[PDB]
Amino acid sequence: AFDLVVIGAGSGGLEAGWNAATLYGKRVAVVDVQTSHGPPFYAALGGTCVNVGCVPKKLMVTGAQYMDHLRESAGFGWEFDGSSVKANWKKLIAAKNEAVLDINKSYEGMFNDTEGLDFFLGWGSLESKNVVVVRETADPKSAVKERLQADHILLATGSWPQMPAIPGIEHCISSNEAFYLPEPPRRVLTVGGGFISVEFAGIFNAYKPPGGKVTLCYRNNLILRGFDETIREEVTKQLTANGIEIMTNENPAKVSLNTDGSKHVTFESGKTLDVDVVMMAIGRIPRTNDLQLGNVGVKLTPKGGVQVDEFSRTNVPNIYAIGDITDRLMLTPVAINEGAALVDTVFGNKPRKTDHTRVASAVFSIPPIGTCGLIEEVAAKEFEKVAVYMSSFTPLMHNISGSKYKKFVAKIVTNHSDGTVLGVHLLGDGAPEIIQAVGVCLRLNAKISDFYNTIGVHPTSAEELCSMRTPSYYYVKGEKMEKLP
Amino acid sequence: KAFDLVVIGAGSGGLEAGWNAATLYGKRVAVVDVQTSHGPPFYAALGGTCVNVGCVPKKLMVTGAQYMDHLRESAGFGWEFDGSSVKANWKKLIAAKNEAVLDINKSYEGMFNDTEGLDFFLGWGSLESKNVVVVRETADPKSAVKERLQADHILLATGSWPQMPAIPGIEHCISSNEAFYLPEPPRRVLTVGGGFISVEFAGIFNAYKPPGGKVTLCYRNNLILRGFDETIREEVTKQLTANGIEIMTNENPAKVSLNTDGSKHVTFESGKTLDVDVVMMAIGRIPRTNDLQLGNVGVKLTPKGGVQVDEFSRTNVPNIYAIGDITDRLMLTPVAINEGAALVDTVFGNKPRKTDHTRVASAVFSIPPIGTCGLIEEVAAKEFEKVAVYMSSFTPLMHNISGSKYKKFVAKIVTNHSDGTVLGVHLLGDGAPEIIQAVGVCLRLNAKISDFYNTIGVHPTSAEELCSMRTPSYYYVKGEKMEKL
Ligand SMILES: Cc1cc2nc3c(=O)[nH]c(=O)nc-3n(C[C@H](O)[C@H](O)[C@H](O)COP(=O)(O)OP(=O)(O)OC[C@H]3O[C@@H](n4cnc5c(N)ncnc54)[C@H](O)[C@@H]3O)c2cc1C
Ligand SMILES: Cc1cc2nc3c(=O)[nH]c(=O)nc-3n(C[C@H](O)[C@H](O)[C@H](O)COP(=O)(O)OP(=O)(O)OC[C@H]3O[C@@H](n4cnc5c(N)ncnc54)[C@H](O)[C@@H]3O)c2cc1C
Ligand SMILES: c1cc2cc(-c3ncc(C4(N5CCCC5)CCCCC4)s3)ccc2[nH]1
Ligand SMILES: c1cc2cc(-c3ncc(C4(N5CCCC5)CCCCC4)s3)ccc2[nH]1
Ligand SMILES: c1cc2cc(-c3ncc(C4(N5CCCC5)CCCCC4)s3)ccc2[nH]1
């Protein structure tokens, strides 16, 4: 039967499926490859976010921040036995595991008491345009155990870590394995400039044993591509100031094992480095190869993502795709938004589509980032006159903390014609929390004057966004100079 | 000496006015204050109450006090150290706060020194005549004249002063002013008042008290923090009690006597007794009109005691104005600052401006803190016929792991249900003050509840919860509460 079958019980899949059984009394199947977090498939019921993404990572960052809190407390008069201090990775992971497994179970409970909503363990594939094969493994020639007849098929299998084709890649891990290392690595190399590499660099930096060293490498000049440039250079500096070695214009060429089990990394430049863990975080790719999409001619974009329209529909009439598989904005709240939007269009004539512009996102680096809308060099290309407001203060408390390097950065980008805010980019503690309501402002087509005529809350870092009245420089036609001529 | 503007009180509102008039419109400005830096004998100084004995030093001290929690909470995330080696040094906190405040003092001098048309005068300002501010050596009219400043315009900006009740033994009590300079942290302390100052200091003393210590907060009425949201009022009461602070509602001191060792024997009106080492009165703050000689020129006061002003900060006497705490409206730094800016724009610029006093975001730095903007349920139910109340409250995952399960987060949105416009937002928990800032911008844009829940969330954050409340938890219709329509 089944009005809807969902392949992938993640952020997008679970929302679409719940908004259908409960909202419209439809019959829904959901397929995922595990009931609980962990090896060998890592992602499981709940999604990447719940099992090996946003949720456990936040807890681990929050754990890592305590290295700073402990150090910084001395400036405020706190003393304790310094050389009795121990960062217990194993207690942290155990505490993370129980937190995730609690959510695993709650969804398990959700399924086992909601009619029109049933869950099927195993690997979903596309047999025909109205049937989904639930096999036992990813092997297409493994035992079948269900064949779900479907009116509507939703593809929500998420994304998967990218690995470059070098010798020794088997000895490298991804973020997935990072969540389940039995020991915190003494020497670790995270590969890539993206947010995952940066966040884990901070986590490992906090929990590493004595004699330790995190190194982060990037093949190009400046990490965190696609983020505001001043923020990119500052985060680089502040990570450096907290002991992380940032190693740009380098890329691993091979990886051999040493006689102790550690990794001997050789870079393209000929430079070498011995580490205990090599974590590849060079990209996330859409997870399509186990779905047998060739069997029904489901089309892909030039980059291996499932092509869809503004209503999440493929070339195949009653097959849909949401979340990370579409290779767009890889964010849990967007995948959730797409899932809820997909349903009420199809199962309730409430035609909603998701807005992908001006979406607030964070990066829980130490220090963290918050961002919404366009960066300045992008805004310059589809607007005639762009204004950039910039304020970079060392917060109140870090004069005392001993963490003088912790500069807060606040940047607003406008179409200077009418002063509409196109972008807002924040660096420093609080940024992720500050930016959320900035999302709401941008959605209300807020102008710069709406910010600086708003009365500040003092003392806050957020305050700064209401204290910038005059541009620092402009972009006209795409050119950067200080004064408007 | 002849000037365009003479400002009495070099504080939040005063300085902003003087700086703006001098730097934006090239006017000749004199600013008067009794000290160039913080502390005894006059506490407030160049920079204002906020810089010297207010928002700035109290935040640093709250931040200091938060490390008690962080150190305890770190164990949940695998941090190990000798807990019996932990102790807080109060003199180091005070010393560090002193440096930070001093640098702002030092910075404000040098602003005067380098900006022409903007001069500082040390001493006590007063109205001799409608165009003459007299500066004397002391607050006493009999003291020697130092200057007689001719003025086209006079701005009164002397702030407020701690109200001290007229009970016997009041001499043995202190105010916030002296609390900032205590040589030792009080083992036992009574903070008298239900307002934000008392609460914040109770948290500070709670963290820094020595072994066997006890903070007690008393308040003559039933529930602390009048004017704030009732759930938050009741929660922060629980969370303070949960962290070891004894709350003493419906109680009020009647007298104080000295014990043999120098401690304080408080007797309440109810007859109950309590021994403490410090009694800090924070029962209110009253406009500082004592020493300004307002009767000489006939400046009128409100029946409440503040300087009466129209919406453009004008007194009854032409060319004499007043802003900030002396007007006895919203005793907040940014409001005074906005009032000063609006005043200088109007008088010396060619466009009238006035401070909007509604929908002003504000904070309380309890642990955890409050962030709030707009109306509370009860006030909204008098103004509007139909009122919705969206609510969300839970102990966040982080704190279930931390061990501080008492730390229940609270988000609330008050709406006029007729059109859905947000009238009030209220928050309790980590990052609340940072979150609420951009919420101030939203409300200025007359945002509706739909604009929040249709905005895409940032995950994982506390703020996210503001964009996830789609149906009212209850309603207020025609003034009456009900769980339904
Ligand atoms: C380390 C890390 C940190 C992140 N942090 C954040 C963050 O802070 N904020 C944020 O917004 N986003 C974050 N993300 C991204 C976020 O997790 C994804 O955007 C989100 O999970 C997308 O949801 P989805 O439904 O598209 O895919 P997912 O939620 O990943 O769901 C895919 C699910 O489908 C299952 N599956 C796959 N193939 C099959 C098959 N053939 N048959 C059956 N089941 C299958 C998988 O087991 C998986 O559980 C992070 C990602 C990573 C890797
Ligand atoms: C403990 C405490 C905590 C606070 N926390 C916050 C907060 O977190 N956020 C917030 O927004 N607000 C806070 N406030 C309120 C804030 O400090 C005031 O609202 C603000 O300082 C008012 O500024 P003002 O310009 O009215 O006068 P003030 O800033 O108070 O300055 C007035 C100045 O006038 C001087 N003066 C007085 N008499 C004379 C005279 N005769 N001649 C010359 N000079 C004179 C004084 O020395 C003083 O420096 C706090 C207040 C206190 C007491
Ligand atoms: C019986 C019902 C039941 C429901 C839940 C839910 N958890 C989260 C739920 C929600 N979504 C998120 C992922 C798909 C469901 C839907 C209702 C509340 C908002 C989250 S419902 C969890 C356990 C349950 N047991
Ligand atoms: C040496 C120090 C020095 C400091 C300043 C200022 N610091 C803060 C200033 C501002 N205010 C604070 C109170 C009214 C002026 C004015 C600019 C906006 C931010 C704060 S101006 C200006 C010139 C200075 N020369
Ligand atoms: C610049 C001046 C300055 C002055 C003080 C104090 N002055 C008086 C102080 C007090 N002295 C009395 C003798 C022991 C404590 C008296 C005022 C109340 C707090 C302590 S603290 C503290 C910090 C200061 N920085």
Side-chain angles (χ1 to χ4, degrees):
Chain A
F2 294 131
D3 271 287
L4 180 71
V5 298
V6 186
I7 311 170
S11 306
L14 290 182
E15 182 70 10
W18 173 272
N19 294 353
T22 66
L23 302 184
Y24 308 120
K26 255 57 183 148
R27 255 168 269 98
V28 185
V30 182
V31 197
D32 212 290
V33 311
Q34 276 178 200
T35 61
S36 297
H37 72 88
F41 310 135
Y42 298 101
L45 174 62
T48 293
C49 190
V50 173
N51 292 283
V52 290
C54 346
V55 164
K57 122 196 156 50
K58 220 289 174 51
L59 296 184
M60 288 166 89
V61 167
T62 298
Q65 286 167 350
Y66 287 110
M67 192 185 54
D68 285 15
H69 288 319
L70 290 211
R71 183 176 50 78
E72 292 175 349
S73 73
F76 293 76
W78 296 88
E79 64 179 58
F80 47 81
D81 186 358
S83 73
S84 84
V85 171
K86 227 272 285 199
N88 191 330
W89 175 258
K90 313 93 192 153
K91 212 290 207 184
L92 166 78
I93 285 195
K96 174 221 73 173
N97 284 339
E98 195 52 43
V100 176
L101 186 63
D102 276 17
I103 303 159
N104 284 150
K105 290 183 206 184
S106 59
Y107 290 142
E108 184 189 79
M110 177 193 53
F111 272 101
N112 300 347
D113 54 27
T114 308
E115 274 287 317
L117 191 69
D118 306 282
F119 164 76
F120 298 86
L121 179 72
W123 294 77
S125 26
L126 228 58
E127 194 173 69
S128 53
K129 90 295 194 304
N130 270 65
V131 185
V132 163
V133 222
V134 183
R135 274 168 212 291
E136 208 176 72
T137 78
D139 192 356
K141 293 150 57 171
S142 68
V144 180
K145 50 197 215 166
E146 291 293 338
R147 268 198 191 77
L148 311 186
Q149 185 74 59
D151 193 20
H152 300 279
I153 293 169
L154 179 53
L155 306 175
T157 53
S159 49
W160 200 251
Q162 186 181 357
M163 305 293 284
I166 53 166
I169 195 64
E170 61 273 23
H171 309 298
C172 303
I173 64 161
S174 69
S175 74
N176 292 339
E177 290 81 27
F179 289 107
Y180 297 93
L181 289 168
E183 278 180 321
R186 201 195 102 209
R187 307 159 296 177
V188 56
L189 179 66
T190 64
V191 188
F195 78 98
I196 292 170
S197 184
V198 174
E199 287 172 358
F200 264 90
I203 289 165
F204 291 132
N205 187 46
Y207 281 94
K208 51 154 153 59
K213 175 98 273 185
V214 177
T215 301
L216 181 149
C217 67
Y218 181 45
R219 69 187 204 195
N220 294 320
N221 215 90
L222 179 62
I223 62 157
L224 286 158
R225 194 160 145 285
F227 285 95
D228 180 87
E229 203 207 49
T230 55
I231 290 180
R232 282 165 75 200
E233 312 216 65
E234 261 299 312
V235 57
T236 299
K237 274 194 277 280
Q238 292 187 35
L239 293 168
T240 302
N242 203 20
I244 296 167
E245 182 101 274
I246 286 169
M247 187 175 181
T248 50
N249 288 314
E250 296 293 329
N251 203 37
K254 52 169 158 156
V255 178
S256 40
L257 293 205
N258 296 300
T259 61
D260 69 349
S262 66
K263 285 77 197 178
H264 182 74
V265 178
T266 311
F267 293 84
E268 289 169 10
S269 72
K271 275 171 265 167
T272 64
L273 185 73
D274 298 292
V275 302
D276 303 304
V277 170
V278 186
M279 208 199 73
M280 291 285 165
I282 64 165
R284 295 277 293 182
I285 57 170
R287 201 175 184 182
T288 50
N289 272 211
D290 297 342
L291 287 166
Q292 301 299 321
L293 299 170
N295 287 1
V296 187
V298 158
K299 197 158 281 162
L300 303 180
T301 58
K303 349 89 205 178
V306 170
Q307 187 160 307
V308 300
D309 66 17
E310 66 194 337
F311 285 86
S312 303
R313 309 181 303 208
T314 350
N315 48 305
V316 183
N318 277 29
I319 299 181
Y320 317 94
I322 58 169
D324 282 21
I325 200 174
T326 65
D327 193 29
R328 221 228 173 103
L329 298 170
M330 300 202 186
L331 296 169
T332 279
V334 174
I336 287 162
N337 204 250
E338 288 172 320
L342 175 72
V343 169
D344 44 34
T345 38
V346 174
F347 294 101
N349 56 248
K350 326 190 198 301
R352 179 180 162 77
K353 63 172 191 287
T354 71
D355 193 347
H356 294 265
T357 57
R358 308 159 302 174
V359 177
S361 56
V363 176
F364 292 87
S365 42
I366 297 159
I369 300 166
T371 182
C372 186
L374 312 171
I375 53 170
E376 65 199 46
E377 57 264 71
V378 170
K381 280 180 179 161
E382 71 151 297
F383 283 105
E384 213 181 335
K385 290 145 67 164
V386 164
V388 171
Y389 305 81
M390 186 170 68
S391 173
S392 175
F393 63 93
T394 293
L396 6 150
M397 64 161 286
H398 293 310
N399 263 30
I400 304 312
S401 73
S403 297
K404 258 290 303 194
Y405 59 85
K406 287 187 177 188
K407 290 182 190 178
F408 195 98
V409 184
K411 256 211 186 160
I412 305 188
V413 176
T414 58
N415 171 19
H416 191 59
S417 295
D418 71 321
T420 291
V421 181
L422 311 183
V424 177
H425 316 290
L426 303 176
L427 167 61
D429 281 318
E433 295 280 8
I434 292 158
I435 199 73
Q436 177 67 102
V438 175
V440 179
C441 298
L442 270 71
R443 279 283 259 89
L444 292 158
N445 299 290
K447 280 171 249 65
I448 185 70
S449 75
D450 293 300
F451 275 94
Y452 61 61
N453 288 348
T454 303
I455 292 163
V457 195
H458 180 66
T460 61
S461 295
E463 211 182 334
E464 211 66 23
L465 288 169
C466 307
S467 314
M468 296 199 279
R469 305 184 50 93
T470 306
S472 306
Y473 51 88
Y474 307 79
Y475 284 95
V476 80
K477 311 268 92 167
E479 180 170 58
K480 187 181 174 281
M481 30 64 172
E482 194 188 337
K483 275 84 168 63
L484 280 181
Chain B
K1 291 87 191 151
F3 302 87
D4 292 300
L5 174 65
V6 178
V7 175
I8 307 171
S12 290
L15 276 174
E16 178 78 355
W19 167 263
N20 278 26
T23 62
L24 303 178
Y25 311 116
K27 305 296 179 172
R28 217 207 167 191
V29 182
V31 173
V32 194
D33 212 299
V34 307
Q35 270 187 339
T36 70
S37 69
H38 65 94
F42 311 132
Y43 296 97
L46 172 60
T49 296
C50 180
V51 171
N52 295 286
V53 288
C55 345
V56 170
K58 77 97 178 288
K59 218 251 182 134
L60 291 166
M61 285 162 76
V62 167
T63 298
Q66 283 171 351
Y67 287 104
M68 182 177 63
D69 291 2
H70 289 317
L71 288 156
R72 176 171 55 76
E73 288 175 348
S74 66
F77 297 76
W79 290 90
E80 300 177 339
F81 47 83
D82 182 355
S84 76
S85 70
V86 169
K87 51 172 261 65
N89 188 316
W90 169 260
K91 294 174 197 191
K92 171 58 203 179
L93 176 70
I94 297 304
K97 175 268 285 169
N98 286 357
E99 299 291 334
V101 176
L102 181 65
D103 291 337
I104 301 175
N105 296 144
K106 289 186 213 192
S107 163
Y108 282 150
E109 212 187 52
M111 171 185 69
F112 279 95
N113 299 344
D114 298 357
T115 316
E116 193 58 38
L118 181 66
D119 295 305
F120 180 78
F121 290 88
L122 178 65
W124 297 78
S126 215
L127 273 48
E128 192 189 65
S129 134
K130 64 256 220 160
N131 288 119
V132 184
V133 172
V134 284
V135 181
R136 302 186 180 271
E137 287 289 14
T138 81
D140 196 309
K142 295 192 202 305
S143 63
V145 180
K146 303 178 78 178
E147 304 287 5
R148 272 193 181 78
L149 313 172
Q150 289 288 339
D152 283 28
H153 304 269
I154 293 166
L155 172 58
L156 306 174
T158 45
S160 55
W161 201 246
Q163 177 176 30
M164 297 290 275
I167 64 179
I170 190 66
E171 332 85 52
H172 306 121
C173 306
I174 64 169
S175 62
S176 57
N177 287 334
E178 294 82 1
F180 285 115
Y181 298 96
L182 286 168
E184 295 175 319
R187 198 191 99 209
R188 298 158 297 173
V189 58
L190 175 63
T191 60
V192 186
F196 75 97
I197 294 164
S198 184
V199 165
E200 289 171 342
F201 267 99
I204 296 167
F205 289 130
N206 189 37
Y208 280 92
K209 73 191 192 293
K214 188 71 187 179
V215 178
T216 303
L217 186 160
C218 62
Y219 176 48
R220 70 204 191 78
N221 287 344
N222 194 247
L223 177 58
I224 69 189
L225 292 161
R226 181 250 304 182
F228 288 93
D229 179 90
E230 201 188 73
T231 54
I232 294 165
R233 291 173 74 192
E234 278 165 13
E235 274 303 329
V236 69
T237 308
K238 289 166 183 163
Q239 310 202 17
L240 288 162
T241 310
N243 200 10
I245 299 165
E246 169 72 40
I247 281 64
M248 212 153 160
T249 49
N250 289 117
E251 298 285 359
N252 198 54
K255 77 203 211 185
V256 189
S257 65
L258 276 171
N259 298 324
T260 322
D261 69 354
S263 52
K264 280 78 197 176
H265 188 68
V266 180
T267 310
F268 294 76
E269 292 171 20
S270 73
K272 289 199 248 314
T273 61
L274 179 57
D275 290 328
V276 294
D277 300 298
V278 170
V279 185
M280 191 194 92
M281 292 284 180
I283 64 162
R285 288 176 62 80
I286 44 167
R288 196 161 183 187
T289 58
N290 313 64
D291 311 312
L292 289 169
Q293 220 100 132
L294 298 171
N296 288 13
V297 186
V299 170
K300 284 193 209 306
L301 301 183
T302 308
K304 217 210 202 216
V307 171
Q308 190 165 65
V309 295
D310 70 14
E311 69 201 336
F312 298 94
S313 304
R314 290 176 291 183
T315 70
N316 61 308
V317 174
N319 300 324
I320 306 182
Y321 316 89
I323 66 177
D325 293 6
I326 203 178
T327 65
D328 205 353
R329 265 256 257 182
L330 294 168
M331 298 204 176
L332 298 166
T333 274
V335 177
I337 286 168
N338 194 290
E339 283 175 340
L343 176 61
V344 169
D345 283 348
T346 306
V347 175
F348 297 119
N350 205 342
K351 224 142 205 72
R353 298 274 143 68
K354 60 201 198 75
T355 304
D356 176 7
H357 291 86
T358 60
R359 305 169 283 174
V360 171
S362 126
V364 175
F365 283 85
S366 50
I367 309 178
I370 293 172
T372 175
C373 183
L375 298 177
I376 56 162
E377 307 166 61
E378 300 94 306
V379 177
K382 307 297 189 68
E383 173 78 306
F384 286 92
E385 199 187 327
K386 293 193 190 79
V387 170
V389 176
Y390 300 77
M391 175 165 174
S392 176
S393 169
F394 56 92
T395 294
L397 175 55
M398 181 250 152
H399 282 307
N400 274 328
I401 293 164
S402 81
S404 291
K405 308 202 181 178
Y406 59 88
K407 290 183 174 178
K408 212 196 285 171
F409 187 87
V410 177
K412 267 202 182 173
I413 301 167
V414 180
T415 317
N416 172 30
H417 204 306
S418 296
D419 57 349
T421 50
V422 178
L423 306 173
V425 178
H426 315 282
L427 301 169
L428 174 67
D430 299 346
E434 299 292 352
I435 291 159
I436 200 87
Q437 176 65 97
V439 178
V441 180
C442 300
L443 269 77
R444 282 264 304 177
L445 284 154
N446 303 302
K448 278 140 165 160
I449 188 66
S450 78
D451 292 302
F452 280 85
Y453 63 62
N454 289 140
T455 299
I456 297 163
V458 191
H459 185 68
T461 69
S462 299
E464 197 175 6
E465 215 78 348
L466 290 171
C467 304
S468 311
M469 277 146 58
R470 226 197 75 77
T471 26
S473 285
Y474 54 77
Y475 305 78
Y476 271 91
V477 70
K478 222 100 183 95
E480 198 195 356
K481 197 201 186 207
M482 35 197 262
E483 57 279 318
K484 72 311 198 187
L485 299 99

